[PDB]
Ligand binder design. Sequence first.
Ligand SMILES: Nc1ncnc2c1ncn2[C@@H]1O[C@H](COP(=O)(O)OP(=O)(O)CP(=O)(O)O)[C@@H](O)[C@H]1O
Ligand SMILES: Nc1ncnc2c1ncn2[C@@H]1O[C@H](COP(=O)(O)OP(=O)(O)CP(=O)(O)O)[C@@H](O)[C@H]1O
Ligand SMILES: Nc1ncnc2c1ncn2[C@@H]1O[C@H](COP(=O)(O)OP(=O)(O)CP(=O)(O)O)[C@@H](O)[C@H]1O
Ligand SMILES: Nc1ncnc2c1ncn2[C@@H]1O[C@H](COP(=O)(O)OP(=O)(O)CP(=O)(O)O)[C@@H](O)[C@H]1O
Ligand SMILES: [Mg+2]
Ligand SMILES: [Mg+2]
Ligand SMILES: [Mg+2]
Ligand SMILES: [Mg+2]
Lengths: 317, 318, 317, 320
Amino acid sequence: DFLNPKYTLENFIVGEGNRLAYEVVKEALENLGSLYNPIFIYGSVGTGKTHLLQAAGNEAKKRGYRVIYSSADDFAQAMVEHLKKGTINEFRNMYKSVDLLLLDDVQFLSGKERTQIEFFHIFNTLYLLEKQIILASDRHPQKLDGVSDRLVSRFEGGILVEIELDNKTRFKIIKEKLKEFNLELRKEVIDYLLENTKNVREIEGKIKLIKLKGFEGLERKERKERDKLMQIVEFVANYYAVKVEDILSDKRRTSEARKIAMYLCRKVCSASLIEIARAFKDHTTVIHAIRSVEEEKKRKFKHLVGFLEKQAFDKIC
Amino acid sequence: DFLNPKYTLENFIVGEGNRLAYEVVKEALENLGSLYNPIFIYGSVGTGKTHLLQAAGNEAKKRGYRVIYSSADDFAQAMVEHLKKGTINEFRNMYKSVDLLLLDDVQFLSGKERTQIEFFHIFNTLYLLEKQIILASDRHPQKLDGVSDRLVSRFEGGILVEIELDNKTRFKIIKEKLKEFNLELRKEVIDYLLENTKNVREIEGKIKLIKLKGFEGLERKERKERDKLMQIVEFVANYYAVKVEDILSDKNKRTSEARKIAMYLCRKVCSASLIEIARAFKDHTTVIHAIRSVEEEKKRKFKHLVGFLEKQAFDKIC
Amino acid sequence: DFLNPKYTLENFIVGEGNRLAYEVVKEALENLGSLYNPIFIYGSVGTGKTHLLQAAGNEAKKRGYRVIYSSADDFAQAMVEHLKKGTINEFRNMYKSVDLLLLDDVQFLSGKERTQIEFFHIFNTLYLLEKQIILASDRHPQKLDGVSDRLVSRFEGGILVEIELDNKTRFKIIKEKLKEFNLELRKEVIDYLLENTKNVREIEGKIKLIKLKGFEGLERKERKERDKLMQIVEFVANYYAVKVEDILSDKNKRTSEARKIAMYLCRKVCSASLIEIARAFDHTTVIHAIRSVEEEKKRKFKHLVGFLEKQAFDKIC
Amino acid sequence: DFLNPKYTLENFIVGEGNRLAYEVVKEALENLGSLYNPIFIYGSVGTGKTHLLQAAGNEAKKRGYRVIYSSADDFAQAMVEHLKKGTINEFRNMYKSVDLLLLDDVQFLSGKERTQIEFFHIFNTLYLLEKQIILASDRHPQKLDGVSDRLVSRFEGGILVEIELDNKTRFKIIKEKLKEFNLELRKEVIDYLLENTKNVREIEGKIKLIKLKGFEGLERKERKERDKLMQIVEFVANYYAVKVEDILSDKNKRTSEARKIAMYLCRKVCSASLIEIARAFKRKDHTTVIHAIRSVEEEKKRKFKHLVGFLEKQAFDKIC
Ligand SMILES: Nc1ncnc2c1ncn2[C@@H]1O[C@H](COP(=O)(O)OP(=O)(O)CP(=O)(O)O)[C@@H](O)[C@H]1O
Ligand SMILES: Nc1ncnc2c1ncn2[C@@H]1O[C@H](COP(=O)(O)OP(=O)(O)CP(=O)(O)O)[C@@H](O)[C@H]1O
Ligand SMILES: Nc1ncnc2c1ncn2[C@@H]1O[C@H](COP(=O)(O)OP(=O)(O)CP(=O)(O)O)[C@@H](O)[C@H]1O
Ligand SMILES: Nc1ncnc2c1ncn2[C@@H]1O[C@H](COP(=O)(O)OP(=O)(O)CP(=O)(O)O)[C@@H](O)[C@H]1O
Ligand SMILES: [Mg+2]
Ligand SMILES: [Mg+2]
Ligand SMILES: [Mg+2]
Ligand SMILES: [Mg+2]
């Protein structure tokens, strides 16, 4: 065993944002490997990829099939010990004799050459034998730099499903979770969890705190420090005429105010990148958006920043 | 076995790009090894080489004949275990006891010297007994570095067939793979699968996805994150007035200096993949030292410009 | 058994590069084993040495004379087989019972002792009994290292016949191979095959191609991927202005140093294979010559090579 | 039989290198097992040992004696198969009955105890029944490791003859082989075979090649390759001043250090074979050349390295 039984088909919630992946996994777990076999699942972190996979193999062991789950960076670490302890073949045949192959976090294949090569062989091998293979990554095939070309066209030749947690999809997931716990559904809670959670981990992370220290316990820790970061409705809106709602959406000098707001949050307010990125969720934007500020600290600028730096101190310190 | 019944001759589609390798493998499967034996197939990625090989040996055992399929690298790992298990003879005998040999992905012989030689013998053995042998690689025999001189000069000397899927070639593969479901007819679908797919894997990779999401699903997704790379209609065309389609550049240092440029941006600002980027050049290698040469020439009267573009992209794209 | 009927004496072709070997085996096949016994035939890969041995043994078994064909590595494996099974006795006796022994590809004796000591006797026996003994190799006897001096003495004792097909020799093979396939002899047909083939395998295979995909339907692609290798008339010829055909030759510092660079370009730029380079010319040469380009990489000359690399990506890519 | 008639005592060429042997055998054939019997001939490979035995046997099977010729390895082979078939008795008596025993290439008795004790018997028997016995060998009796200290005495106890082929001895041979064919004598030719052949097999290896592809055919093949091997007169001579002929002659450490290099360059640069290297100047065996260039990188473990890398650079530019 390396599958946890607490993940299952029913158990997983379905909305138009992970419906297709759900049904590919379910619709295929019937004729195992003989329906449509190379299934690649990909989605943002905490999109439920791991669930979906753990949940497939669980159904297989229950139905009696011979099954392996493994993260790609643990497949590597095994192959690397078996290689050392001169047992690379009982390793291979272990994998070649699965009714279902569940390879998780495929993205960790980059750079590992022989460590890839190895999988390529069990792949074709299980494929040719019409066994069932389910891959899963954080990124689409195309984006796998540092993974051999012959594997990527391999991945694309099957079924690519994306898991894109939209809004209506988060609607359902929050709603169903609150029901799961036996908390009561109410617009206030559902709407907060809507405008404050992007992945399922975040949701359920928060739905447990709700199950633990009420809801009026959330909006203090969660919102208060990020009300100190209402520095947008604060100052940069009032300086060079900016409307809050437009600055919270990347959209052409209207968008030179942003680069300042994020900066003031870092240096004066001491907030973390992640803390700051939750005013915009791609955490590199902030970093070079804050550097370009002093990358352009070279004509009638230096004193403008300082005047505002002194302005936030008075207000907040 | 290792032969999947799936692939078969009928089940494989024909146009003037793989017609040759078909009517070679077809006639050759009648008097096996007697008409013409050492057939050597090579194409690009997912060209249909494995289909063909699989299809033949399936027709073969379908007639009684003894048939083996293997990748070159599984063959490796078969020889070297037999070796450790000291049964290297029943290994040899097994291969010399066939009417047809299907050696797929031959290219994986590079480097292996013991791993090759062993095949050399079963090759020669099979040949002189006039038994049928078909090879397959991603490359032409003479592009097979790391392979004995004596095997290459054996590969060249049977029959060399390439499979070049071009225009009027794939068209058929597209228009035929649709009746596989029920999408046989609409111009919009086909014209998308025409200017978006090179190999057959992509051609069925889309179709199945399309027969699921529905075509319009893949016109937003495959048209949105490829529209951040609509950074071609965006700005690269507007500084040094280079025409757009000229940037899919079949040969002037204008649409070449701007060719090398556009790719640099997609890589740094849009954080795109070498493959995403390499689908601008409607090949991975190209992009690399074209993305390096830009900063290989960073240190001349060339710098701040880029910095000014980077700002534009960071504003017009971020 | 191992004698394939398709190889015969009028099924072979005769020129001033193989005729001697041909008549050696033609003359010495009539008075068998008596005329001249140790026949050592040798030449580069694809020289027709396998044909000859095969074509000989055929005529002999036509005339009833007890023949054995075999590769030397076929003999090796066969020995150990009989050996391990405990029946080496009937092995020797079989081999000593022939009127004509044909040992093909002798080079594969190197390193093998009992695997080779056993041939010794066979040889010696057959020989004393004036029974025909024809050996084949890719190299000259004295080039056969790891092989007993006693066996080499045995080899050099009989007749050595080299086969080299230079310029005049090949025309006759092409001419007759073109007639063999029911193809029309034409100057463009014949002339291409001249400057584009070496071994007779190469000859028969372009012909096989042109019997199927036209002729110019392949003077296109063939001369096209060797057109991208026209990298010599392209640039290096016009720098240290040394002309084209002079570079395709080994002799100081203006052509021997312009040749190295040209090789470098087809490897680093046009990403061509070591074999493909060598047709602008054995593998050995290219490898340590392009290594010596970066063996003398040790300062501002790097800046000069870096320029032509830039010239290459511009003009070709 | 195993006696190829092609071998006759007239048929064999005599020079005071293969004289004594030839004499003792002819001398001891007119009265077998009577004059000096246990004849142990030995000498370099391709000396004519086999010839002499074949010839000797042939005569004794012309005078109506009972003769057996066998190689020492083939004697073992037979002894074993009989030992299996349970026929060692008729096998023994077969060998004990010969008027004349010919045992060629005795070198292959080594390491075969039970496969050799048998012979020591046939020997004693035939010897006491005063019957003729001739052994041939690669090495002198005293040189034979892995042979019974009892058989070696026996060997040494009869007659030892060596066959060293000198130069005058070779002269006569070349002369008469040319004569044997329809070839004409002339200086360049007969003188070519001299500094180009050592064992008699080489002599008639050329002559069969000459009576086939002229003489202006080997001048290139057999001498052009070994003009590139004139690397001892192109570089190793033109560095640390050690002149051509001084390298070939087995003698300061100035010369001994030139060879190790000279030989190296042929191997790794021109890819010459270990045989080719030795056949070019100093020829004892293989051992010499090979483990000496090995002593090159065994003495490569630091300022030795750079001087060689500069030489390789020279031999690549000049030849490649
Ligand atoms: N659609 C869904 N329905 C029910 N539960 C879900 C769900 N998606 C995720 N979960 C739950 O959230 C937790 C984390 O999800 P999971 O680990 O599957 O996502 P993931 O594997 O994509 C994150 P990573 O990016 O680290 O792989 C699990 O305990 C799982 O039960
Ligand atoms: N002409 C044709 N007709 C029908 N199907 C085809 C086809 N050519 C290719 N295919 C399909 O493409 C898929 C993969 O192709 P295949 O494996 O034969 O090419 P290939 O061997 O070049 C892949 P790789 O480059 O990884 O070896 C198969 O599922 C097969 O059905
Ligand atoms: N002079 C000639 N006449 C007719 N056919 C010839 C020929 N020389 C070569 N061939 C053809 O070339 C093919 C291969 O020749 P062969 O196998 O004898 O060369 P070879 O033995 O040198 C290859 P290797 O060196 O790998 O053993 C044969 O099919 C034979 O028909
Ligand atoms: N003195 C001589 N006169 C005439 N011919 C001679 C000769 N010595 C050798 N030969 C010839 O040279 C060939 C080789 O000589 P032979 O085989 O007798 O020497 P050998 O017994 O030393 C071979 P090995 O040492 O390898 O067993 C024979 O075919 C024989 O015709
Ligand atoms: Mg996961
Ligand atoms: Mg394949
Ligand atoms: Mg051969
Ligand atoms: Mg002898």
